[PDB]
Amino acid sequence: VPTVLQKILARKAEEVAERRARVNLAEVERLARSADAPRGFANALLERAKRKEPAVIAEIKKASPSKGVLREHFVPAEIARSYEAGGAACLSVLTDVDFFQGADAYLKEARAACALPVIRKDFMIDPYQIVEARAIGADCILLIVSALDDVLMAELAATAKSVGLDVLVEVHDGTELERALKTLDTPLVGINNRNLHTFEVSLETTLDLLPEIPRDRLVVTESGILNRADVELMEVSEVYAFLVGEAFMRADDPGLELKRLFFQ
Ligand SMILES: O=C(O)c1ccccc1NC[C@@H](O)[C@H](O)[C@H](O)COP(=O)(O)O
């Protein structure tokens, strides 16, 4: 529905077709069976959150639709190592090329550089992309409720499980939340505080949904985390899992900014 999302998804269908033409599904499936074992993306968040410790998914993002270029000097392996040293639980690596100035290679490089699990941050609309995520070494994929009907969403999640990927489902409102909870049993329920129609950010997007989130799910609050008051708000509300990019991409030492926001 969101205009920018429609444009991304239209492009995404083209890119999938183009890649499938060059590398067909059977080959991507062979590469996925051969990849390094998944590192346990959900487990890494769950083991910290259950101890009331910050579970930070640190995001490697060169540019974005809402902000333009976020980091001039962009070396994924170095960002990954800084993130790990600063206390991140997992990484998020944008692999979308035309809207986030990302690349699949950035995920391979970030993952090889550290021992943390990595979510492929991209726009999944086709089982091909899910199998491909595992072939490039991802430990988790992203499903965006705004972008999917329920049957397709269940199908993509089932494809992910069958290649050993964890699933992060992202919602923006109560209607999307209830579709996600009814359709998927992943524990990882991501709430995006950034409205994709206006690009406005509200941390209360997360807080207002907590009364509908079962205790067997883990809330991952996404976007808008910029300062320590934001972190305090979430932790007092018993939100311990975060997806954060801009706050770190604007800093000289991204891992140090992570330590300053979460571990002092
Ligand atoms: O950030 C954007 O401009 C944007 C635009 C269109 C679609 C999705 C978008 N962002 C996806 C969102 O998951 C963010 O990359 C992460 O939540 C990290 O947010 P940040 O901490 O950088 O505000």
Locate the domains of the chain by residue range. Answer: 1-264
Q: How far apart are CA 164 and CA 40, in angstroms?
A: 9
Q: How far is the CA of 223 from the centre of ligand 1 (A)?
A: 6
Q: From 194, 230, 234, 257, give the residue whose CB has the most ligand 1 atoms within 8 Å, as the site to mutate.
A: 194
176: Cα separation from own chain's centroid: 17
Secondary structure of residue 20 in the 3-state scheme: helix
DSSP letter string, 158-192: HHHHHTT-EEEEEESSHHHHHHHHHH---SEEEEE
Half-sphere exposure of 41 (CA within 13 A, CB side): 30
Resolution in A: 2.1
Beta strands in the chain (DSSP E): 55-60, 63-64, 68-69, 90-94, 118-121, 140-144, 166-171, 188-192, 218-222, 241-244
For 95, residues 6+ apart whose C-beta sits below 8 A from its C-beta are 102, 103, 104, 106, 107, 120, 121, 122, 136
Q: How far is the CA of 30 from the centre of ligand 1 (A)?
A: 32
For the chain, the 3-state helix, strand and coil shares in percent, each to the nearest 5, are 45, 15, 35
Technique of determination: X-ray
Q: Buried b vs exposed e over 140-161: b needs ≥16 C-beta within 10 Å?
A: bbbbbbbbbeeebbbebbebbe
Indicate if ligand 1 lies below 6 Å from the C-beta of 12.
Answer: no
Q: From 171, 199, 222, give the residue whose CB has the most ligand 1 atoms within 8 Å, as the site to mutate.
A: 222
For 170, residues 6+ apart whose C-beta sits below 8 A from its C-beta are 142, 143, 144, 145, 146, 190, 191, 192, 222
